[PDB]
Swiss-Prot record:
Known function: May be required for DNA interstrand cross-link repair. Also required for checkpoint mediated cell cycle arrest in early prophase in response to mitotic spindle poisons. Possesses beta-lactamase activity, catalyzing the hydrolysis of penicillin G and nitrocefin. Exhibits no activity towards other beta-lactam antibiotic classes including cephalosporins (cefotaxime) and carbapenems (imipenem).
UniProt superkingdom: Eukaryota
Coiled coil: none
Protein name, per record: DNA cross-link repair 1A protein
Residues of the full protein shown: 700 to 1040 of 1040
Consequence of changing residue 139 to N: Impaired nuclear focus formation, reduced interaction with PIAS and increased sensitivity to cisplatin
Expression (tissue specificity): Expressed in brain, heart, kidney, liver, pancreas, placenta and skeletal muscle.
Subcellular location: Nucleus
Family label: Belongs to the DNA repair metallo-beta-lactamase (DRMBL) family.
Upregulation: During mitosis. The mRNA encoding this protein contains an internal ribosome entry site (IRES) in its 5'-UTR. This 5'-UTR generally suppresses translation while specifically promoting expression during mitosis, when cap-dependent translation may be impaired.
Subunit description: Binds constitutively to TP53BP1. Binds CDC27, which is itself a component of the anaphase promoting complex (APC). Binds PIAS1.
């Protein structure tokens, strides 16, 4: 059944709750972003109002064939009325089209649902600064102090420098990047830019990227693999067998592959700096795991919450085990006692 952390009290609303059938009492289904664990259940047969960003609504229409009459896109950073309730969509610094949702309940309670987010100090100057938030529905993916990672900028600098050096040493090397969802487009676009190439990909992935409102995108991507020296493949194909196989397909145009796997966190992060990352190599194939995250680190999450000073926190991630729930509640209390709210 629909869990309580997906329901907004005092409303008829749910968030990211499309896989439970008709939720009793739901008059509007909000969708924070287009990732499968969140949209699970939507299709062309859905006949309830879906509220989301413009970009998410482009993907619902083009990839899932949801009918236009049920898609309700909202502009960001704008006070809107939905079934008699004031709401605002804010940028979540996650994947393209991802939002946080502010609900202003008729009784005067204010609720923030972060969806999936990477907390940033820039959020402290959005419409969030203007009033008090009483309850926080929080993306707790990486809510433990072991989870450190570098900035997105540091990671992209490493990837660009690595790729440019490799291809300049060997003009016959191919660069491959893995993907299994939207998000993390900066990895493959920054590398293609430094090399003066478009990124080549499947027709299905090209279609997905053309929904994202990225500026000048027609200049950066292509379905012609032959004209491209940065290829995108499914994340599943980023291993020695899959890459050897792909190289055969390129017909002796290339004699070396340098491949990137943008993981979330990996336990090389506790010890190893970004400067010191090394690849796994077999023969003429090398694979780099890079820690490019679109979720908050522990310290980023803690800074946002200590800034916001919510009265009550409701985790939306890692809620399935008692040990995880108890650990998270301990951190929340630490943060509250340290900051004095
Ligand atoms: Ni997500």
């Amino acid at each position: 059944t629909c869990p309580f952390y997906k329901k907004i009290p005092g409303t008829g609303f749910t968030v990211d709750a499309f896989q439970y059938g008709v939720v009793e009492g739901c008059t509007a289904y909000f969708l924070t972003h287009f990732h499968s664990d969140h949209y699970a259940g939507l299709s062309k047969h859905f006949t309830f109002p879906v509220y989301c960003s413009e970009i998410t609504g482009n993907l619902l229409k083009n990839k899932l064939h949801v009918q236009e009459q049920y898609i309700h896109p909202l502009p960001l950073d704008t006070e809107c009325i939905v079934n008699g309730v004031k709401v605002v969509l804010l940028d979540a610094n996650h994947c393209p089209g991802a939002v946080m949702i502010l609900f202003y309940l008729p009784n005067g309670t204010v609720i923030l649902h972060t969806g999936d987010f990477r907390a940033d100090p820039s959020m402290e100057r959005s419409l969030l600064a203007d009033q008090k938030v009483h309850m926080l529905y929080l993306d707790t993916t990486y809510c433990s102090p072991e989870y450190t990672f570098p900035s997105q900028q540091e990671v992209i600098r490493f990837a660009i420098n690595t790729a440019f050096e490799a291809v300049t040493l060997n003009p016959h090397a191919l660069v491959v990047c893995g993907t299994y969802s939207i998000g993390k487009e900066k990895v493959f676009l920054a590398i293609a830019d430094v090399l003066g190439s478009k990124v080549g990909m499947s027709q299905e992935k090209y279609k997905t990227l053309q929904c994202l409102n990225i500026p000048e995108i027609n200049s950066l991507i292509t379905t012609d693999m032959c004209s491209s020296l940065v290829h995108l493949l499914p994340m599943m194909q980023i291993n020695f067998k899959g890459l050897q196989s792909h190289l055969k397909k390129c017909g002796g145009k290339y004699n070396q592959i340098l491949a990137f796997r943008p993981t979330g966190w990996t336990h090389s992060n506790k010890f190893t700096r970004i400067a010191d990352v090394i690849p796994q190599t077999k023969g003429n194939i090398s694979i780099y795991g890079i820690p490019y995250s679109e979720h908050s680190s522990y310290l980023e999450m803690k800074r946002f919450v200590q800034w916001l000073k919510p009265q009550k926190i409701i985790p939306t991630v890692n809620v399935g085990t008692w040990k995880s729930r108890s650990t998270m509640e301990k951190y929340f209390r630490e943060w509250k006692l340290e900051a004095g709210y």
